[PDB]
């Protein structure tokens, strides 16, 4: 809520990705904190298993509700940190409601 | 300090090109036998695999930690 | 430009891509506390970060939970 991206680059979302989709490289941000310089989910490689949703300790990477993201070009499907963070900002209100409904179950 | 990964012999193919990819910056490799590391229980068996498959081999002898004598009483010696 | 200032450059051979197609905690107040040590669920428990206890023991430094980047003022 403050505005600090949740991911702290533990990189186990990369470890448990069955398809090798997520690529993460990180370095200490000047703040001294730990953040990901590059976070790239290759959606064409992704098989939408939802384990990344499962694995994240801070729950920074989530399976968002939108299913309509068909794209004219293959490159658009590859997603870097800025698209995903932008995707996160757009759907945060519903993502928060969805996680709110299902967290007791998990 | 665990030693369970220093038990079985492994033979690993020589490392090759890993150029950066222009579109996403991901590492890209043209060598198929790169990620392949076969595990063999004994030095003799691994050497055999190289000979029949025709790959060149350069075996490195296992080096195991030498026995080291330790005793809690010894360091309590003011003398030394 | 971006977070880590990605700047495909005027001479890069990749800045070609954008042609015809486009490309906070410091602002957070210091949480004052009474106790020597404080927790940081991230806010909301299960919906936060693994809880850690920060030692705001020296006013010299406001403890910063490694997860939220929130500075706490003893």
């Amino acid at each position: 809520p403050s505005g600090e991206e949740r991911c702290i680059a533990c990189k186990l979302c990369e470890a448990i990705c069955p398809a090798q989709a997520i690529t993460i490289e990180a370095e200490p941000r000047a703040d001294g904190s730990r953040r990901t310089t590059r976070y790239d989910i290759d959606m064409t490689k992704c098989i939408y298993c939802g384990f990344c949703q499962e694995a994240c300790p801070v729950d920074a990477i989530v399976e968002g509700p939108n299913f309509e993201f068909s794209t004219e070009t293959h490159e658009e499907l590859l997603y870097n940190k800025e698209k995903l963070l932008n995707n996160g900002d757009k759907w945060e209100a519903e993502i928060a409601a969805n996680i709110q409904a299902d967290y007791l179950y998990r | 300090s665990g030693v369970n990964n220093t038990k079985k012999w492994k033979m690993e193919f020589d490392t090759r090109e890993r150029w950066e990819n222009p579109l996403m910056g991901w590492a890209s490799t043209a060598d198929p036998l790169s990620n392949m590391v076969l595990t063999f229980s004994a030095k003799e068996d691994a050497i055999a695999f190289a000979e029949k498959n025709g790959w060149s081999y350069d075996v490195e002898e296992k080096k195991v930690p030498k026995p080291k004598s330790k005793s809690y009483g010894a360091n309590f010696s003011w003398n030394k | 430009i971006t977070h880590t200032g990605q700047v495909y450059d005027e001479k890069d051979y990749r800045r070609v891509r954008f042609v015809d197609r486009q490309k906070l905690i410091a602002q957070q107040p210091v949480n004052e506390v009474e106790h020597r040590i404080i927790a940081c669920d991230g806010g909301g428990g299960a919906l936060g970060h693994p809880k850690v206890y920060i030692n705001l023991d020296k006013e010299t430094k406001t403890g910063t939970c490694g997860y939220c980047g929130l500075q706490f003022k003893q």
């Binding site: 590059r38 490159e75 997603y79 | - | 990605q6 015809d20």
Partner: peptide
């Protein structure tokens, strides 16, 4: 409740930096 294509790009930096030749002639 009561031109804009995302162009993908690497966000990391240069990494290996080469030695600039001295612009002073010798």
């Amino acid at each position: 409740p009561t031109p804009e294509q995302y162009v993908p790009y690497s966000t990391t930096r240069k990494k290996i930096h080469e030695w600039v030749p001295p612009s002073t002639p010798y």
